[PDB]
Structure formats: structure tokens, C-alpha cells
Amino acid sequence: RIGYGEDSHRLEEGRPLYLCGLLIPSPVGALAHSDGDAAMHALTDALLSAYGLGDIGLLFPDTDPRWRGERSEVFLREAMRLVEARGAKLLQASLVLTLDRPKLGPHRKALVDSLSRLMRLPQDRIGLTFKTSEGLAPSHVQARAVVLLD
Amino acid sequence: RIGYGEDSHRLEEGRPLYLCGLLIPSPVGALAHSDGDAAMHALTDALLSAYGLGDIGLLFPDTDPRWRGERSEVFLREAMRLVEARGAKLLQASLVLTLDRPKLGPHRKALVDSLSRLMRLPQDRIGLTFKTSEGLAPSHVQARAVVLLD
Amino acid sequence: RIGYGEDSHRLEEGRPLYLCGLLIPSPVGALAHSDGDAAMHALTDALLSAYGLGDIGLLFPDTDPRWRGERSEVFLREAMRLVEARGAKLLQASLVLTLDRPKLGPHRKALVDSLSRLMRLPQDRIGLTFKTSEGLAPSHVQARAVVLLD
Ligand SMILES: [Mg+2]
Ligand SMILES: [Mg+2]
Ligand SMILES: [Mg+2]
């Protein structure tokens, strides 16, 4: 099975930046409703999608209590619980993060380590790459992810 | 086999909106010479791509009378005919629709039912997720799609 | 295994345009430090991604004299070497190129032939499709690619 997901958020000065589950030192952070972790959101949608289960807007509306104030690993692990209950064995996640600042290169090890631990995948099965928008989208973070299961 | 397809269209106020084969009540709709159904176009290109057959610009140009003015479902069924004749067995389609309005949430069932009916896939093999652009692309509808076959 | 990658470049008047390893006659070309071949970059990142090896920013930085000034095909071939050494057999590449000008249609055969030769894949396993941005991004070339291996 395959799943594909995307996420993006406005970034603003003096807000915390969360990506791949981690708080990243940055001059900008998401202007969100959530922690705005675009990588987790894209991955979560990709997982749900692989089983036709909907998306984070359907399954995690803030109006449900359990989701209000929650960090995005809660959404990811619930999607993992849902596909696992349907017999899924996650094999791989490959995703691209796009943002002009800050540079994610120095945080490569930490970001992969976190995704590896969250999705319970070996490091060679976490394919994370970083891009800038080349001035296409200087005020957003963007994420696009593909997952592979069984 | 895997295929990847994308489409985007300018949205204009007061034009009809077509997605996944359906008319969706909306304040905005594609400005296009086609019906502008980004979902159909992205899926069609992904199917073509999975066999290297080209893209919808090549196979369904507005110059070709058989295709001019037709709804986009006609091009998807033709792409399905072409890949089926080359032995394809479509397994899964996962795609993301991005647009700032209207909300697609209320239409989720009919949209997924449509894709399942047109592509002849069970609903758990239709992975449809909805996003807004968070202000990055407030005047366009975008779709990106992955298909898996065989 | 699966890998996903993306690339974009600002386009500027009177610069040469390189795509899929070829010179493409054009009024606009990438402004950059590389040849700005978005197809090559996105394919290379997708390959690297399929094995968790990093991305082109990590492995091919212009601080490294081995890589500065090299054509992007040299990067793609090195990524091929690295995954092949880890047992991979590339099976398929499917990608989308997005740009408002020049038209890529007239170059389809040459572009696909180049990808086929470079990646040593049969033509039906090269899924290249072309799009314009519909004015979303009229001054960039964008590429997004999925690769499948084994
Ligand atoms: Mg989000
Ligand atoms: Mg279209
Ligand atoms: Mg590049």
C-alpha cells in the first residue's frame, strides 16, 4: 500500500518552530492552531490515506477534547494505531520539507532520529530531504510525504 | 508500477467547481478551457505516467475534437483503457486536494464514492485528503496524486 | 523501496535552461550556482531518500571541490552508485515538471530518452509529465519525483 500527504503553515517571527516532533531553534515558527508541525501532519495524512481513513481534518477536529492543545505526535500515533489494527506494517516514509529559514541541515541527525523513533522504522527507511522555496514561499513551511506499507 | 501526477487551476468567483467528477457548490470555480477538475487531471496524468504514455497535454489536447469540451472523467476513463490494455491492474490511488475554499469536508463521502466508482477501486484503496494552502495559494486549486498498479 | 524528492529554481531571462540533463532552447533559465536542472535534482534527492542517505545539499555541496561546477547528471550517477552499492535495483521513475515557459512538449522524446539512458530504465518505466503553474509560480521551474526500487 501507498499513501501520500501534504501540509503547510504560515511562519511568523517570534513563534516556536516544531518539525518532525522536535522544537527547532528559529527566528520563525508556525502561525497555527496546532503546533503546526508540517512534517508530522503530512506523514499522518499519508498514513490515513493509505487505508482510505480520511485526513487529520476529519479525525482530529479541535472540537473533540482529546485533540485540543495536543502536539502532533498524538495524531501520528493514533493513525499508526488505526492502520496497524487493519493489518498494516509500515515499511518506509520519504518526505521533503521546504522552507527558506532556518537551515535544517544542522538538525539532520536529530530530525531523522525522531522520525525513526516515532514511526518505529530503521534509519535507512526514513527518507528526509530539505529544500528552500527559492523565494517561492518565504513565509511558509511545507511538507510532502509518501509512505509505503507491507 | 507507480505513477505520480499533478494539476492546478486558477479559481475564479462565480464559475462552477468540479472535483473528482462532481459539481461542488462553491463561490469559486476553475477558470479553464477544460472543466478544471484538478483531481481528475492529476489522477489521469499519474496513470499515464505509470506506463510512460505521456500526459494529458499530449493525449487530450484542445485541438483534438474527440476531447475538446468533454468532461475530465472522459480522459480518466481513456487513460484507464490504455493502461488496462497494457496489462495494468490499478490497485490504489492516493491524492491530496489543496484549496482555500470551499470546504470539501461535507462532501467527503460523495467525492470518495465517485473516485471509487470511476476507478473501480474499493473505498479503502481510495486515499483522498483535503488541505487549505494557508494563504500560500488562495486563488488556485491544486491536486497531487500517486497511483499503484499490479 | 520508495523515494520522493522535489526541486525548484527561480527562472531568469537569458540564462540557459537545463532539464533532464539536456540544454533546452528557452527565453529563461535557472538563476543559480548549479545548472539548476530541477529534474535531475529531484530525481537525485528521491534516490538518496529511498535509502535515507541525505539529500543533494548534504552530499553535493558547492564547498566540496569534487562537486562544485559539475553537471547535475554527475550527482544523479553518484546517487545511483551509492544505492546500487546497498543492493538497490532501480525499477521506475515518475516525475512532474512545472513551468509556464518554454513549452516542453516538442522536447518530450529527447527528455525521456535522456532519462532512460541516464537511469538505465526502459522507456515505459520513465513517467515524465509536463505542467504549467497556471500563474501560480510563473517565474520558477518546479520538479517533483517518485522513484521505485527493487
Ligand atoms: Mg498542519
Ligand atoms: Mg487541469
Ligand atoms: Mg536544484
UniProtKB/Swiss-Prot annotation, chains A, B, C:
This is 2-C-methyl-D-erythritol 2,4-cyclodiphosphate synthase. Involved in the biosynthesis of isopentenyl diphosphate (IPP) and dimethylallyl diphosphate (DMAPP), two major building blocks of isoprenoid compounds. Catalyzes the conversion of 4-diphosphocytidyl-2-C-methyl-D-erythritol 2-phosphate (CDP-ME2P) to 2-C-methyl-D-erythritol 2,4-cyclodiphosphate (ME-CPP) with a corresponding release of cytidine 5-monophosphate (CMP). 4-CDP-2-C-methyl-D-erythritol 2-phosphate binds at residues 7-9, 33-34, 55-57, 60-64, 99-105, 130-134. One of its GO terms (molecular function) is metal ion binding. InterPro entries: MECDP_synthase (IPR003526), MECDP_synthase_CS (IPR020555), MECDP_synthase_sf (IPR036571). Binds 1 divalent metal cation per subunit. Its EC number is 4.6.1.12.
